[PDB]
Structure formats: structure tokens, C-alpha cells
Amino acid sequence: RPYTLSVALPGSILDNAQSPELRTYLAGQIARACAIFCVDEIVVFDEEGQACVQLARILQYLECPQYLRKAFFPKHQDLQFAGLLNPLDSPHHMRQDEESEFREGIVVDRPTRPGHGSFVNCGMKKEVKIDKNLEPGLRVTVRLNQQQHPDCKTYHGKVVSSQDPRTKAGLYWGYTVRLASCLSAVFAEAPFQDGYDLTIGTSERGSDVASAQLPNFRHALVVFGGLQGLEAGADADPNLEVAEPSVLFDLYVNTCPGQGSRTIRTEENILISLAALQPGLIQAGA
Amino acid sequence: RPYTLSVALPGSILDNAQSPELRTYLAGQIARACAIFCVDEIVVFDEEGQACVQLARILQYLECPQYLRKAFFPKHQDLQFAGLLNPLDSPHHMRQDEESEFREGIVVDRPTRPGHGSFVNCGMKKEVKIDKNLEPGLRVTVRLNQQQHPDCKTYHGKVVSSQDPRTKAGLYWGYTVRLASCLSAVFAEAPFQDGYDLTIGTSERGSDVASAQLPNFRHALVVFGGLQGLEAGADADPNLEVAEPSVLFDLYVNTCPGQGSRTIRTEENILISLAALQPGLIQAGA
């Protein structure tokens, strides 16, 4: 299985926006930054919190394919500016008329005939029929059979792991989103039994990324502070009694030497930092 | 003299914004990207055009220190959303109460006494008096004398090259902005007699930036295409009869291998590309 990369950042960044419209745009900028770099997981953490819930909600809306949005998100006041947004244009976001090996779907909520598998809509012209009888409203990944009876009232396909499009066909297939009550929860509530075997924090107080060597790894995590830096969710977390955030991570880096602004915003810092790291990440995640 | 770096991009990117507010924010994102990376020059070029004039205007507003904005920009409808913007927080943007070796100023438009030098305001509590009698309304760079008669009705300082804060004290001191009628004007209308001795264009069609070696250089230029790529201002320019933009530049790079979005927006692409290049630029510009 290929390496994973997870990004963590505070919900509080949305409090800095200057209008609701831009509050939405900024959440959009995060999603795009993470998608461009093929991030597997985004962790929004409370820097000790509706900022966190809103940010996560937006992130999930944008990851979810369009044909599934009506079904998966009731109208909210967090998605009222959904429109003013940039698409991720990720490999799993396709038109109805686009031929593809795999497609996300939702299982229709119907009885079905006794032996028979579920009905799933993958935004194709016809529902897709499958192998198994699964609990409805649930989101799945379907691999469409290559032979498609030209007359059939449905298409046919098989449900598969959601890792398969990455691992089997090299395709980025979106991120997941995880809420964490604090900075220590970002590490502790990690989705891999494993642990995150490589953690990297960013700071203008850190060491030149040029002079950093990454250890071999399976699950990388990169953590961004707010406007107030990683110090704020570190002081404020009671499980962390430290005089500086350096020690929390395997590496602590400044990813933009000799910046010409006093401050880098975190939607800025995600692009710069992931760029500066991408080679590094690529050669160590072997 | 240290190396220079110039960024070029099309005005037409503003046509893609979805609201005037965001049209302004996006121009803001450009300025910030260029400031973070200490860019010396931004060239906005017409991809054969009010988009270009608006973008340039915004860029110049944001570079100009705040105490000089009233003086240098009449109220326009291009700066009506000036407010909804992010400051560059660049080394030449200081409070009135911030002690600094150098400060930008404007020469007051007054006669003065026959021998005597000009009056300049550098947003200090008192006007600054200088060495020379200069033509008024003109923008200058002032180095304040170290000894400051504590009673004097004015401070005293000397006008200096605007390169001095970079070259002498390592300080980023802003960019200039240049309009170009077409893609060939970006190269031809260059501000260095010299030429730009290193040109780099960006494309997902280009070669991995990992595998690129930069030649020694003095004046680098990096060029971004629109939504439609560099092809559009290349076909449309009549001085350029080529089947592909590769050949226009010394290097043609893809700066984000295996992206998980079909498209990178150019305010995105500036951050990623300059990051991916920064080391490279640093070691060749010796």
C-alpha cells in the first residue's frame, strides 16, 4: 500500500475571514490545496468551536462527487455559499457521460429481491446493480463490469475497497476529514492503528527545509498553526506541558526562507509547505 | 548586485472571478504570493484589456506603503474593495512609531529656500528634510540620519537608490509592475538592458522540475499562463509563429507532478511553482 499524507489545521482560520462569502472561499482554498497534493486526510482541530464544524462541513461537501451532494447534505447555512466555490476537479468527479473504471455511489434504500444485490446510483444514466445486499444510504466505491449488456435496464458492477483506485489504478480518490478536540487529539485519534510514523510541523522558528532529511515512512502528518502559530493549541491543550512546539514533532521546519512578508497565511502556507516537501515525501514513502 | 526575479501573468485571470469582491481578493492573492517570495517585478500581460489595467492598479496600491496611498491613488472604482484585502506586511510597511533605517516618502510640492533641500513625508510625525531640491510629487527612498536633533521641527535624511535596502541591508523593498501588450512584449520590453538571461515557463506539459538544472543567472523571469495556458497568448501574438511554447523559454517545467486536480489556478500555481523553484533560484543566482 502507498504512503498516506495527512494535513492538520485549526478551524479558527475561518474567524479571520472578513465576510461570509470569503469565509466560504477560504475553506474552498484549503480543499483545493489538499486535493492538488493528493492529500488522504484533513484533520481540523480545535485550537484548545463552530469554526471547526463549518470548515469540516465545507471540506466534505467539496470532496463528495456532485451527483451525491443532494443525497448526502441537507441544506445547511454552512453551504449557502456552496456556489461561490471552486471545484476540486478530482479524478472521481466526472460527468454522467464520462467512461470510468470506478465511480462513487450511494446504495438506494429499497427491499430488493431475496438473493439479489443492492441498487446503487453512481450518477450514471441507469442505476448500477451489484453483488451484495448492503445497508442503504451508505457510500460505496463501485468497479463497473467491462461487459455491459447493451439493453439491460441497469448496469452491473462490484463494490470494492475505496483504496483500490489509488493503489490499483494510481488515481487520487479524495480525502477524508476528521475533527479533533485539541492538538494532542490530532496525534492520538489517528486513523491508523500504526500511529503516524512521521510528523512535521511548520514555523518560521524551525530549521531550513533544505537541510532536513525525511525518514522512511508509511503515514506522514503535516501540521499548520493558526495566525497565532502552533503555540496556541499547545499551551491551551492540558495534555501538553512544553516550552516550545519543536519537540512534539519528528521535524520542525521553516519552508520559506527569507520571506518578504511578516506573515504567511495558512492557506498560503499549505501550498508552499507541501510544495517544498513533495520531493522528500516522494522519495522517502517508497 | 543580487539576482532579480520577475513574475509574468495574464490580466485575464480576473475575468474568471465570480464576484467583484473576489475579483479584488484574487488580485490581492497575487500580490501576496509575489511578496512572500521577494519578487522584484510583476509583469501583467494581455493574452493577445481592462482586466490588465485593474490587476496592475491593485498590485501597485498594495505595494505602495499606506501613508502614501491617499497621495498616489485618486479614488477609483478599481480600489473600491481596497478594504477587503490582505496587507503585504512587507519590510517597507511600517507604523509611524517604528524606527527604521530607510522609509519610502513623497516629495512635498513646495518652493523651499534657495540653497535648501526638499521636504519629504515618510509618514513620520514630522516631515523629513533632505539634501537635494527634487521635482515634487515624486516617490523616493530616504535613509534617516542616525543623529536626530531632538528639538528640530523636522528630521533629516538623505535620498538613496531604491535598491539600497535590498542590496545594503538585505531588506525586501517591494516589486514594480509592468504592463505588456502581448507575450513577446514580456521579453522585449524588459527593464534590464541586459535582457532576462533565464526564462522559465510553467505547464503540466513540461519536464519534471526535480530533473531541471538552472544556469547561472542575474535576471530570472517566470511566466504563468491563464486558464487557457501559455498557448493562448502565443497563438494570439503575431510576433510568435511556434507549434508549442516549450521553445520560447530556457526551461519549461511541470512544478507539481501527479496533481490530484485536473487544473491548477494561477494564484495557486504561483505559490507552488515559486516554492518548487526557490532552491535552485537561490543556488544559481550567487
Author numbering:
A (entry chain A), B (entry chain A): 71 to 118, 136 to 373
What do the study's own words say?
Structural analysis confirmed that SPOUT1/CENP-32 is a SPOUT MTase with a trefoil knot fold consisting of parallel six stranded β-sheets sandwiched between two layers of α-helices that promote dimerization of the protein. Our SPOUT1/CENP-32 structures also reveal that SPOUT1/CENP-32 dimerizes via a helical segment in the catalytic domain that packs almost perpendicularly against an equivalent segment from its dimeric counterpart.
To assess if the observed activity is specific and depends on SPOUT1/CENP-32’s ability to bind its cofactor SAM, we mutated Ala356, an amino acid residue located at the centre of the SAM binding pocket, to Asn (an amino acid residue with a relatively longer side chain; A356N) and characterized this variant by determining its crystal structure and by subjecting it in our MTase activity assay. We tested the SPOUT1/CENP-32 A356N variant in our MTase activity assays and observed that this variant shows reduced activity, indicating that the specific catalytic activity of SPOUT1/CENP-32 depends on cofactor binding. Depletion of SPOUT1/CENP-32 and induction of SPOUT1/CENP32 A356N-GFP expression in our stable cell lines failed to rescue the centrosome detachment and micronucleus formation phenotype.
